[PDB]
C-alpha cells in the first residue's frame, strides 16, 4: 500500500524503464535492443512490441506503473496495427509532465480534463489533414509503401480489395508455386477471440491458424467435458482439428479441461457465438449453412447435444485470435449458402421498417461476400516466406488507411496539429496546464526519431513545427519536404488510436491516488 | 536492462573474453587452451572452434555480448567451412575500436553505415586478388596443402571431383581394405537440416551419419505420433534406422516424442522436403524414384497416411546435419531412376520458356549426377583414422576454394586489400571514422598470428602492407616470401565469409541501445 | 556546493523550522515558546523576535536558507517597527508554494515577476483602505490601544507629537517620581548606526543609551589610536562617556582596538557624521554648535587633530543603534544654537534656487526643533517600570501609523485586498501562476492567527475574505466585525514592510541555482 | 565585438572549412570551434529558452546579428548596444585554450 506522490515515483520510475527501451528503436534509424532469452543466443531485435512484451522490473509498484502503459498501448496495434511503440512513447510524455504538476498541487482532475480535451480535438485536426484513399491507386500507392515499396504487391492488395470491396475479408495464405494466386472463396470472419490465450495454436504470432477443421455450433454456453465427449471421438477419426463455437463456453470441466489437457492430441479451437439473443442464434445456423452447418446442437428446446453425434461443418482453415476469428472456406453447397442469402434479402422486404434491415444487410454481406484469399508467390521458399511476410503486413496497412485515411508520418502530424492547437483553453487553469502537457506531448515521438538520427532534437520539431500541411523532415534521408508527397506517411487510425491509449493510460494514472501490492 | 554505454561495457568485457581465448590459437605458432571437463581429465586444445562452445560467462550482460559474436562467427565456418576463430577475432576488433567512437559521440548509424562500406569494397578487392582453381592440377595443388601436404589426397579430391564435377556431391567414407576405393554411386544430397539439434546421431561432428535407412516422403506436415505409429512398427523389423522426409513436419505429439522419446531404440532422422508448392512435391516422388520411393504418402487428396502401411525407399546411408542432407545410396532400380531424368529431360522441352528450365536443369543434376564415394586407405586403423580425418577435412576445402578462388593466407588478403582502401570515403564523417575502423580491423588476424611467433606485430603488419601482391610474412618459417607460391593460402569464401559476419555482429552491437536479461 | 532543487529542498526545511517556531507565537492566543538558555532557567517567551534570533539548524544548508528569511524579515521591525514574525510567515508562504511551481518546471524569473507584481498592486491596495491619522485625538486613539488601551498613554503621544510635531524626536525617559513629567529639550537625533554591534551599551535593546557623554566631532575617518590618545586621557578625567562622530572612523588600531579594548573602561560610543561632502561637513560644526561644538578637529586643512586637546561638547544623553543616534540634550548656550538656525535661515534667503532649501529647511528643523522628552511615572518601581515599556512601545507605533496611517489589522487587511487582486495579470502564464501564489500567500497571517485560537483557518479566511471593507474576525472576542471599529488594527507601514521583505527574500530565494557552504 | 557571445560562435562558423598538419589535427580543430559556442548555449540557457535553436540561428546569420538575450530578439547585436571589447573576448578564447592545451597534454598528477 503506497499513496500519492510515494506511488508516483514508482509508476514512473518503470514507465521510464518500459518507455526508454522500447521508445529506442522509434525511427529509421532505430537502434538494437539485445534481448537474452531461456535457451542461449540473445535475440538482437529492433521490433517496439517484442520488446516490451520483455519488460517486468524487479520493484512491484514500478511493475505496476509499467504494465499498465503495456495493456493499453498494446489497444493501439491492436485496433490500428501500429501505434505501441508510440503509444508508450506519448504516454511517458504526459505521464513524466503530467506527474509534474500532480506534484506542484494541480488538481488531477482538471489536469487530466484539459489533457483529455486537446485530444477530442487534436483528432478532429489529423482528421482534416488526412488524404483521402479509395481509388485503386490509392490502396496501390500505400500498399506498395508498406511493402518497403515493392511495385508489385499494392497491385495485389488493390485487386484483394477489388475482388470484395475496400472492407472485406481479405486473406494472406502462403505459396504453392511461382506465379502468386488470387481467388474469391467462399467465408465469413468475425469479431470472436480464442476462449483462451494458450489456444495460440503454433504462430506465436497470436493466432490459431488450423488447417482442415469442423466447426460445431452450439446454442448454449458449452461447460463441461463428459456430456460432450463423443465430440472429441468425432475430431479423433483423423480430421485432427476442432472447432467449438458457442455461447459463452465456460471452463468447469471443459475449457479447463479441453485448455490443459490439450498439449497432446486434437487442435481444439473453441471461440463464442457472435451477439446475441435472435442475433447470435441466426448467426450460428448462417454459420452452420456455411460451413456445413446441419449442427446448432444446443439449439434450445429442440435440444440435440451428444445425442445428435457426428453431422458438423468442416471448413479449410479457421485463423482465430483475440478480437476476431476468420472461417476461410466453406464447404455448403454454394446454392445452398445462396438460398440463404436470398432468404434473409426477402425477410427485409418483410422486416417492417426501423434497424433490423441493418443486420439484415450487415448479415448478408458476411455470407454474400465471401473470402479473398491471396496465394503469395516466387521462388525459393526464403524468398516465398519475406513476402509473405511483407504482405500479410501491408494488407494490414491499407484496410486501416482504407478508413481514416493517411497523415504525414515521420512523426509530423501530431506536431502539425498541436501547433494549430496553440491557443485552446478549458473550465480554469489547472486545465490549461494540463492542455499545454499533451500538446508539448505529442512532439515526443519525432524529437525521438530524430535522436536516433544524431541530430539535434529542438531544431527539427522547431522547423517542421512552424510549417504548415503535411511539411516534415525525412529522417530517412534527413531532408525537410513534404512527407506525404516523400511517401513517408502512415494511416490516421494509427495516429488517433496513438495519441488516444497515450492519454486513456496517462489520465488513469495522475488520478490515481493508492497502490496496493504484496 | 541496461541501456547505452553501460550495455556496451558489458558486451565489450564478454566480447573480449570469448575473443581472446579462441584468438590465442591462431597463427602456425598458436597456444593450447585446457578446458576442463564433466568427467575428468580436460582436454588440452588449440582448436578455435571447440574452445569457444565452451564459453558462457558468469554475468548476462556479458554472456549475452558473447554469445552474439559466437552465432553470427558461427556461421563463418558454416557457410565457408573456415572462419570462426578469425570472425572472432575480427568482431572483436570492430566492436572494440567501434564502440570508442560510440562513446565519443559519433553517430553509431554512421559508424556502422561506413564499417559496412569499407566491407563492401573490400570483398570486391581479395576477389580481385584471388587465384582461379579449375584445372586437376589447381584442386590438387589446393587439396595437398590442406592434406598438410599428402600429394596423395589432392589426387583424391581431383579424381572426386572430375568423376562427378567440381559442384558435386563427394562423400568420405571410411575404408575397408589397405588400396584406396572412389565410386560414383546412385545418391542426391540437398540444403535441409535435421529437424532437432539432438537429431545428432552419435557423431558429435554434427551430423546423423545413419548406415542403412528407409526414407519416408509425406507431403505434409507430419505432427503426430499415434496416426504415423505403424511407420515406426516397420522401422522395428530390424531396419533399426528411420527416415522421414515431409512438409515442416511439426512437434506436437511426432518430433518432440520421437525427441524426447528417442534414446533406447530406433534411429530416428527426420528432415522436410525441399523447397515448396509443386517444386518439393516433385523433388519428394523424386527422392522417392532415387530411394525406391513407392511412398509420398501425404500425397494430397490421394492420402494414404498410415493406411499404406510399409512399402518405402532404402538407402545405404543418410549424412543429414543443419543445412545439409546426404542420400548416399539409392536403390531404384537404375535404369528406372533414368527414365525420371529423361523425363524431366522432355518436359523441359515442353517447358514454355521463362526460367522453369532453370529447376528443370537442377533438378535433373540430381539424379542424373549421382554421389562420388571415397573409400581412403591405409594399414592401420590407427593410420586409417587420421588420412579420413585429413581427406574429409580437404575435400571441403577444395569445394571452398573451387567456387571464389584461393587468396594469400597467412592474415595477408586483408591487410593487402585494405591497404588499397586506404583513400576510401562515405556520405559523412562519422562514416570515415567508422570505414578507418574496419580496416585497422582487418589488419586483427596476422598481427595476433605473429603475435604467437613472439615476434612485434606491427612490424611485420608494417612490411606486409607496404609490399604489393600476395607478399607476405609466412610465420611457419617466419619469412617475408611471396604467400600464394609459398602455398600458405586459405579459399576467397572463409576470407570473404569471415569479414562478412565480424562485421554484421558488431553492426548490430555498436547500434544497439538497451539489453534486457533476468 | 548544491544545485538546483536539492538546494531548494534544503532552503525550504529550515525555513519551515524557523517559520513554524515564530508563527506559533502569532495571533492574541498565541503561544508559548521554551527557550533554554547558557546559565540555566529557560525563558518562555512568546515574542516573535525573541524566537527567531535563537534559530540556527545543524545543517549548513537549512542554516542557509533560514538566516536569510531572518535578515530580510529583519528589516521589518527595523523600518516599520513591526513585521518580522509576519513577515516569517509570509515569507514562508511565498517560499513554500513559490518553489512547489520552480520544481513543475515553471521559469523562476517568471514566477518572481509575477510575484513580484500582485504585491506592487496590494501595496496600492492597503493604502487605500488606510484610515488617516492626524487629530490629536486620532493619535489618541492609536496611541492607547497600542498601550493595550491605557487612556493616558494616548494622551501622552499626543501631547509629545504635538509639542513637537508628528514627525518629532521623542524621548521616553524613565521616571524620577509619581506625577509624570513632558518637556521640549535641546537635541538633534539621525540616521547614524553605532560603528559596532558590540558598541551595544548595557540595553540589550539594542541601543547604546549612554548617560552624560562627550560629543568629538572629526572631519575625516578616525582610524587609530596613539594619534587619537589623549582623547581617551579626557574621557577618562571622570566624565566616563565618549562620543565620536567623524568620517567612517576605520578600525586598524581605534574603532578594533577601542572594541576589543573596551569591556573594562571609558564607554566609548562610535558613530560617522550624516551625508557627505558640504553636507556631513556643516552638520558637524552644527552638531558642534548643539552639543558645545568647537571642537571639529579634523578640519581639513585646519587640522587640530589632539594638539587641539579637550574642548569637546556634552550633552545629557545619546541612544545610538544601528540606522539612527538621538542627542537628547545639547548645552549651547540656547541663545547660541538660536543664531545657527537663523543664519542657516539667512543663508536660505540668498540660497539661489534649486532644491538647496530642501536641506537648508531640513537641516535648520533639527536644530529648531528639539527633542521632546517624555517622564513616564507611577508609583512603585515596578509599575513605573511596565508603564514605561508600554510607553516606549506605544509611541513607535503612533510614529508609524502617523505616516502611512491604519489598517484593519487582525490579519484582515492582507486578506482584504489579496481578494481585489482576484483578477490580475502578467506578461504570461507562468507569471499568473506566480501571481496567484503572493496571494493564498496573504492568506498567511490570520490563518494562522485563528488556528492559534483553535477554530478551523478555511472557514473564517473564507468569511473573512468575502465581506469588502475593514470587516474581520476579531480573534480576542472571536467576533466577525469591523475590525477598525473594535480597535484590533495596526500602522500601514508595518503591514506594508511585512508584505514587502516577505516577497523580498522570497523572491531572491526562488531564483537561487546554487549553494556554497563548507 | 558583438556581445551577447555572438561574436565567437560568428568567427568560428567562418571556420568550419579549416585544417592542419593531420586528422587529429582537425578533430582537435572541430573541438575547439564547437567550444566556442559555449558561451551563449549557456547565457541562452540561464535565459530559458532552448540554446540549439538560438545557437544555430546566430551561427547561420553573418555580421553581428545575435540574439539579444536582455530582450530575446534576434538583431544586430553591436546596434543593440549588446558589446563587448575585443581584447576580452579575444583574451577569453587565448587563455580557455592555454590552460586546455596544457591539462590535455598532462600525463602525470603527483600530489599528497
Chains 1, 2, 3 share one sequence.
Do not use: W
Not at 502462403?174 to 489456444?199: A, K, W
Not at 488447417?211 to 475430431?235: C, G, Q, T
Not at 486501416?400 to 497523415?407: K, L, M, R, T
Not at 515521420?410 to 478549458?426: E, F, N, Q, W, Y
Request: negative net charge; proline residues 3%.
Amino acid at each position: 500500500v503506497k499513496f500519492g506522490n510515494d506511488a508516483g515515483v514508482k509508476m514512473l520510475r518503470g514507465v521510464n524503464v518500459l518507455a526508454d527501451a522500447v521508445k529506442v528503436t522509434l525511427g529509421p534509424k532505430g537502434r538494437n535492443v539485445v534481448l537474452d532469452k531461456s535457451f542461449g543466443a540473445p535475440t538482437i531485435t529492433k521490433d517496439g512490441v517484442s520488446v516490451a512484451r520483455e519488460i517486468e522490473l524487479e520493484d512491484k509498484f514500478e511493475n505496476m506503473g509499467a504494465q499498465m502503459v503495456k495493456e493499453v498501448a498494446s489497444k493501439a496495434n491492436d485496433a490500428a496495427g501500429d501505434g505501441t511503440t508510440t503509444a508508450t512513447v506519448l504516454a511517458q510524455a504526459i505521464i513524466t509532465e503530467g506527474l509534474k504538476a500532480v506534484a506542484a498541487g494541480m488538481n488531477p482532475m482538471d489536469l487530466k480534463r484539459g489533457i483529455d480535451k486537446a485530444v477530442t480535438v487534436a483528432v478532429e485536426e489529423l482528421k482534416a489533414l488526412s488524404v483521402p484513399c479509395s481509388d485503386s491507386k490509392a490502396i496501390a500507392q500505400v500498399g506498395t509503401i508498406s511493402a518497403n515499396s515493392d511495385e508489385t504487391v499494392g497491385k495485389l492488395i488493390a485487386e484483394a480489395m477489388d475482388k470484395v470491396g475496400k472492407e472485406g475479408v481479405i486473406t494472406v495464405e502462403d505459396g504453392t508455386g511461382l506465379q502468386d494466386e488470387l481467388d474469391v472463396v467462399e467465408g465469413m470472419q468475425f469479431d470472436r477471440g480464442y476462449l483462451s490465450p494458450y489456444f495460440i495454436n503454433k504462430p506465436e504470432t497470436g493466432a490459431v491458424e488450423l488447417e482442415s477443421p469442423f466447426i460445431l455450433l452450439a446454442d448454449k454456453k458449452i461447460s463441461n467435458i463428459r456430456e460432450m465427449l463423443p465430440v472429441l471421438e468425432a475430431v479423433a477419426k483423423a480430421g485432427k482439428p476442432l472447432l467449438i463455437i458457442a455461447e459463452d463456453v465456460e471452463g468447469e470441466a471443459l475449457a479447463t479441461a479441453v485448455v490443459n489437457t490439450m498439449r497432446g492430441i486434437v487442435k481444439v479451437a473453441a471461440v463464442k457465438a457472435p451477439g446475441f439473443g435472435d442475433r447470435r442464434k441466426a448467426m450460428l445456423q448462417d454459420i452452420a449453412t456455411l460451413t456445413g452447418g446441419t449442427v446448432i446442437s444446443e439449439e434450445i428446446g429442440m435440444e440435440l447435444e451428444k445425442a445428435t453425434l457426428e453431422d458438423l461443418g468442416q471448413a479449410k482453415r479457421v485463423v482465430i485470435n483475440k478480437d476476431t476469428t476468420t472461417i476461410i472456406d466453406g464447404v455448403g453447397e454454394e446454392a445452398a449458402i445462396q438460398g440463404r442469402v436470398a432468404q434473409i434479402r426477402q425477410q427485409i422486404e418483410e422486416a417492417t421498417s426501423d434497424y433490423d434491415r441493418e443486420k439484415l444487410q450487415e448479415r448478408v454481406a458476411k455470407l454474400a461476400g465471401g473470402v479473398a484469399v491471396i496465394k503469395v508467390g516466387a521462388a525459393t521458399e526464403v524468398e516465398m516466406k519475406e513476402k509473405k511476410a511483407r504482405v500479410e503486413d501491408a494488407l494490414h496497412a491499407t484496410r486501416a488507411a482504407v478508413e481514416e485515411g493517411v497523415v504525414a508520418g515521420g512523426g509530423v502530424a501530431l506536431i502539425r496539429v498541436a501547433s494549430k492547437l496553440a491557443d485552446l483553453r478549458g473550465q480554469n487553469e489547472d486545465q490549461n496546464v494540463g492542455i499545454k502537457v499533451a500538446l508539448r506531448a505529442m512532439e515526443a515521438p519525432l524529437r525521438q526519431i530524430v535522436l536516433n538520427c544524431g541530430e539535434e532534437p529542438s531544431v527539427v520539431a522547431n522547423t517542421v513545427k512552424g510549417g504548415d500541411g503535411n511539411y516534415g523532415y525525412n529522417a530517412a534521408t534527413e531532408e525537410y519536404g513534404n512527407m506525404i508527397d516523400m511517401g513517408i506517411l502512415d494511416p490516421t487510425k494509427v495516429t488517433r488510436s496513438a495519441l488516444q491509449y497515450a492519454a486513456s493510460v496517462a489520465g488513469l494514472m495522475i488520478t490515481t491516488e493508492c497502490m496496493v501490492t504484496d
